[PDB]
Amino acid sequence: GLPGMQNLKADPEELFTKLEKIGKGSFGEVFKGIDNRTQKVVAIKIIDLEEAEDEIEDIQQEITVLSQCDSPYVTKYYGSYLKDTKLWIIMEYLGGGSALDLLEPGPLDETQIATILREILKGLDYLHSEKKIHRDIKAANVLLSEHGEVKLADFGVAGQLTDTQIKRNTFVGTPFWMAPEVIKQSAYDSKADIWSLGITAIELARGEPPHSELHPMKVLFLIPKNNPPTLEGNYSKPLKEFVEACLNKEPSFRPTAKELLKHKFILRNAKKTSYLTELIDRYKRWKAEQ
Ligand SMILES: Nc1nc(Nc2ccc(S(N)(=O)=O)cc2)nn1C(=S)Nc1c(F)cccc1F
């Protein structure tokens, strides 16, 4: 089965206008698109099923997890279409781009950092309450609407906890952002996302994650054997402590997403999400020059 699968007679090439590429996901390529019936903009992930082996079950899992999410903090899923050998996965388009994109004109301030982290946490609180793990939290997978709303994206490696499986142990994620227990393939749960959030916090503060100048294969020993990273530079003590709370080698010492929503860095610095429009306006003007 495949949740949201549409009638095969429906031609997505007729129902949507495919525009420019806006990314490359864990699976397939993603395009900006127009829904021809509503004229709303969508994001379209296209996957060639023929040149895909052992990736199709992964695709099905992504669409399943996506279709089971109903939250302001998770990109919406609008269904899937088949066009010959290609699968068109229709998703909510977020006009502000990724947090990583919004970093290109220059550093964020700590109000912006706190606000983005707060909204990521609302998303993680939702997922974790649903017994889901994202497993690929990073600034590239954090999207903003053009009104400044923040949502999680790319569920390509997301995991589901059950009653018959209270922990996962699969090796998945992006190396710089992966928790030591995931790399080591110990039994892990939602706390793995909390580690990834700490790395993402550093990324949002500094522009890059720890070890970013190294070959990804080095982190397979670097992360499990070294002391966890800390945020270095001229950042507030609350922000440095937020990061340390996340980046503890012991998963049970990491706070829950729910708890982190009350962390002093968040309460003291976060403001209305609408203010993030400035960050998006900043990017547009910057891109406008070049
Ligand atoms: N749902 C969704 N909307 C957008 N919008 C978007 C993307 C890029 C840009 S930009 N800054 O002009 O290149 C602007 C808006 N991207 N997007 C997705 S799924 N992004 C995405 C992602 F989040 C992870 C991997 C690949 C991807 F293409």
Query: Residue type for 47, please?
Result: I
Report the C-alpha gap between 136 and 178 in whole angstroms: 8
Q: How far is the CA of 222 from the centre of ligand 1 (A)?
A: 30
94 lines ligand 1 (CB under 6 A): yes
27 lines ligand 1 (CB under 6 A): no
Atom 23 of ligand 1, residue of closest alpha carbon: 141
Atom of ligand 1 at shortest range from CA of 26: 25
Which CATH superfamily is 1-93 part of? Phosphorylase Kinase; domain 1 (3.30.200.20)
Q: 32: which strand partners?
A: 43
Report the C-alpha gap between 84 and 128 in whole angstroms: 37
Contact status, residue 133 vs residue 127, Cβ threshold 8 Å = yes
Q: How far is the CA of 97 from the centre of ligand 1 (A)?
A: 5
From the annotation, which residues make up the binding site?
22-30, 45, 92-94, 141, 154
Residue given tokens 């793990």 in the structure block? 133
Q: How many CB atoms lie within 10 A of CB 230?
A: 13
Buried b (16+ CB within 10 A) or exposed e, 171-188: ebbbbbbbbbbbbeeeeb
Report the C-alpha gap between 23 and 31 in whole angstroms: 7
The domain over range 94-290 is classified in CATH as 1.10.510.10: yes
Q: How far is CA 127 from the centre of its chain?
A: 12
Q: How far is CA 187 from the centre of its chain?
A: 22
From the annotation, which residues make up the binding site for Mg(2+)?
141, 154
Report the C-alpha gap between 206 and 239 in whole angstroms: 12
Q: How far is the CA of 8 from the centre of ligand 1 (A)?
A: 26
Q: Which two tokens stand for residue 24?
A: 């490359």
Q: Which two tokens stand for residue 255?
A: 């706070």
- Supply the residues annotated as catalytic: 136
Contact status, residue 133 vs residue 157, Cβ threshold 8 Å = no
Contact status, residue 73 vs residue 151, Cβ threshold 8 Å = yes
The SS3 assignment for 74 reads strand
Q: Give me the helices (H) in 86-190, please.
A: 99-102, 110-129, 180-183
Documented resolution in Å: 2.0
* Biggest alpha carbon–alpha carbon distance for the chain: 58
Nearest to residue 136, comparing CAs of 100, 165, 179, 94? 179
Domain borders along the chain are 1-93, 94-290
